[PDB]
Design an enzyme around this catalytic site. Sequence first.
Site, PDB file in Angstrom:
ATOM      1  N   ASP A 154       0.835  -1.219   0.000  1.00 25.36           N
ATOM      2  CA  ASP A 154       0.000   0.000   0.000  1.00 25.36           C
ATOM      3  C   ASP A 154       0.866   1.264   0.000  1.00 25.36           C
ATOM      4  OD1 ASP A 154      -2.323   1.659   0.043  1.00 25.36           O
ATOM      5  OD2 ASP A 154      -2.500   1.518   2.233  1.00 25.36           O
ATOM      6  N   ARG A 158       0.406   9.265   0.735  1.00 26.35           N
ATOM      7  CA  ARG A 158      -0.307   9.307   2.024  1.00 26.35           C
ATOM      8  C   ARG A 158       0.355   8.430   3.102  1.00 26.35           C
ATOM      9  NH1 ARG A 158      -3.463   6.478  -1.530  1.00 26.35           N
ATOM     10  NH2 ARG A 158      -3.502   4.231  -1.007  1.00 26.35           N
ATOM     11  N   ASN A 159       1.085   7.402   2.673  1.00 23.80           N
ATOM     12  CA  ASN A 159       1.736   6.490   3.626  1.00 23.80           C
ATOM     13  C   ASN A 159       3.210   6.725   3.839  1.00 23.80           C
ATOM     14  OD1 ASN A 159      -0.386   5.128   4.781  1.00 23.80           O
ATOM     15  ND2 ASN A 159      -0.546   3.650   3.073  1.00 23.80           N
ATOM     16  N   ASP A 172       2.808   1.859   7.201  1.00 26.88           N
ATOM     17  CA  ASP A 172       1.713   0.964   6.784  1.00 26.88           C
ATOM     18  C   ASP A 172       2.138  -0.199   5.913  1.00 26.88           C
ATOM     19  OD1 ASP A 172      -0.807   1.289   8.001  1.00 26.88           O
ATOM     20  OD2 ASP A 172      -1.081   3.230   6.966  1.00 26.88           O
TER      21      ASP A 172
HETATM   22  N1  LIG Z   1       2.061   7.553  13.234  1.00 26.03           N
HETATM   23  C1  LIG Z   1       1.126   8.484  12.878  1.00 26.03           C
HETATM   24  N2  LIG Z   1       1.151   9.751  13.386  1.00 26.03           N
HETATM   25  C2  LIG Z   1       0.239  10.689  13.057  1.00 26.03           C
HETATM   26  N3  LIG Z   1      -0.766  10.464  12.187  1.00 26.03           N
HETATM   27  C3  LIG Z   1      -0.913   9.237  11.617  1.00 26.03           C
HETATM   28  C4  LIG Z   1       0.038   8.163  11.931  1.00 26.03           C
HETATM   29  N4  LIG Z   1      -0.337   7.096  11.213  1.00 26.03           N
HETATM   30  C5  LIG Z   1      -1.434   7.425  10.490  1.00 26.03           C
HETATM   31  N5  LIG Z   1      -1.767   8.713  10.730  1.00 26.03           N
HETATM   32  C6  LIG Z   1      -2.878   9.473  10.155  1.00 26.03           C
HETATM   33  O1  LIG Z   1      -4.118   8.864  10.521  1.00 26.03           O
HETATM   34  C7  LIG Z   1      -5.071   9.017   9.472  1.00 26.03           C
HETATM   35  C8  LIG Z   1      -5.564   7.660   8.991  1.00 26.03           C
HETATM   36  O2  LIG Z   1      -4.458   6.800   8.655  1.00 26.03           O
HETATM   37  P1  LIG Z   1      -4.681   5.517   7.745  1.00 26.03           P
HETATM   38  O3  LIG Z   1      -3.300   4.926   7.591  1.00 26.03           O
HETATM   39  O4  LIG Z   1      -5.768   4.624   8.272  1.00 26.03           O
HETATM   40  O5  LIG Z   1      -5.223   6.040   6.315  1.00 26.03           O
HETATM   41  P2  LIG Z   1      -4.357   6.626   5.067  1.00 26.03           P
HETATM   42  O6  LIG Z   1      -2.908   6.614   5.426  1.00 26.03           O
HETATM   43  O7  LIG Z   1      -4.994   7.929   4.662  1.00 26.03           O
HETATM   44  O8  LIG Z   1      -4.612   5.531   3.904  1.00 26.03           O
HETATM   45  P3  LIG Z   1      -4.218   3.962   3.928  1.00 26.03           P
HETATM   46  O9  LIG Z   1      -5.479   3.270   4.432  1.00 26.03           O
HETATM   47  O10 LIG Z   1      -3.953   3.619   2.459  1.00 26.03           O
HETATM   48  O11 LIG Z   1      -3.015   3.846   4.805  1.00 26.03           O
HETATM   49  C9  LIG Z   1      -4.335   9.743   8.349  1.00 26.03           C
HETATM   50  O12 LIG Z   1      -4.592  11.151   8.496  1.00 26.03           O
HETATM   51  C10 LIG Z   1      -2.885   9.450   8.638  1.00 26.03           C
HETATM   52  O13 LIG Z   1      -1.953  10.397   8.090  1.00 26.03           O
HETATM   53 MG   LIG Z   2      -1.931   4.936   6.091  1.00 25.69          MG
END
Ligand SMILES: Nc1ncnc2c1ncn2[C@@H]1O[C@H](COP(=O)(O)OP(=O)(O)OP(=O)(O)O)[C@@H](O)[C@H]1O
Ligand SMILES: [Mg+2]
Length: 312
Positions: A154, A158-159, A172
């Site tokens: 993935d 965004r990741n 991720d």
């Molecule tokens: N370690 C972290 N510190 C701060 N924010 C985070 C962290 N990990 C994830 N986030 C934030 O939390 C929210 C959701 O993350 P999530 O990984 O579920 O979705 P995504 O990254 O948008 O897409 P994907 O499902 O493809 O990973 C996003 O705004 C992401 O940037």
């Molecule tokens: Mg993510």
Amino acid sequence: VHIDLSALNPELVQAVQHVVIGPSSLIVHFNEVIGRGHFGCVYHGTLLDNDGKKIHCAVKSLNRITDIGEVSQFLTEGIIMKDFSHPNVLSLLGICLRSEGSPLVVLPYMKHGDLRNFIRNETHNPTVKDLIGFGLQVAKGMKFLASKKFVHRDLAARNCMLDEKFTVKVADFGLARDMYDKEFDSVHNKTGAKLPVKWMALESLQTQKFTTKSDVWSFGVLLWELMTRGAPPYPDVNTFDITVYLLQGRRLLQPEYCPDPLYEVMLKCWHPKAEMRPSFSELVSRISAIFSTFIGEHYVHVNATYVNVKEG
Ligand SMILES: Nc1ncnc2c1ncn2[C@@H]1O[C@H](COP(=O)(O)OP(=O)(O)OP(=O)(O)O)[C@@H](O)[C@H]1O
Ligand SMILES: [Mg+2]
Ligand SMILES: [Cl-]
């Protein structure tokens, strides 16, 4: 979700003990939602260190891990991931193994959020150098994962997260696996619209298999995201029929500020034959060279209303 922990292999339970974080070590602030993505929900958390020092973390529920078998496999991966240490790879601080919910991963809190928003923000003013530099950091993190034979599945802007030093951390990795498994084989997702198909290699769309070479394809799309300052790839193509689009002989257009050799790299990442795509080792080498030619004087100008592509 009920998970019978007594149904886990005893040797596994013992082996993952050093990765498991207990409730007396972690408070998950469920009322402090950071956001939700493809396969989980992220919350603010507070972790205690060995000395009892208070640590700000992010806690992600892995909502598509719902069955003993999936939990078991996840634990094996957790043991592997805990041992990863690289400046461009997000740390796994630990896991919460729950009897009454999907398991959680505990992550360092990333002060500056994700790379896509960081470059999209109109009050930020990145140069070509800055954007390529971020891409180089991502390539380095991926070079590390590839060296461990660990498939991301993935990868996207965004990741890639930014910490307090603005160091990019690939995040991720591996965690989308069960969501993909379920959504590929769901009567409710025959269209494929629930999956991040815009980052998937052709062969992954066709075979449902993911490899480091398919991560290379995703990395090419990630470079496109970088050079467009976070434009959505292929607007209005969000289904398995992206395969039809691709097979007509199409690729993402060259962004206006994307240097020609970097667009050449992107086209290599999208090679029709997976085995002909560059390794992440090669990508780090090539991108380091392109990066070195810039001095931080070419500001990348974009507008919300359209994607500016190479024209002159
Ligand atoms: N370690 C972290 N510190 C701060 N924010 C985070 C962290 N990990 C994830 N986030 C934030 O939390 C929210 C959701 O993350 P999530 O990984 O579920 O979705 P995504 O990254 O948008 O897409 P994907 O499902 O493809 O990973 C996003 O705004 C992401 O940037
Ligand atoms: Mg993510
Ligand atoms: Cl520049």
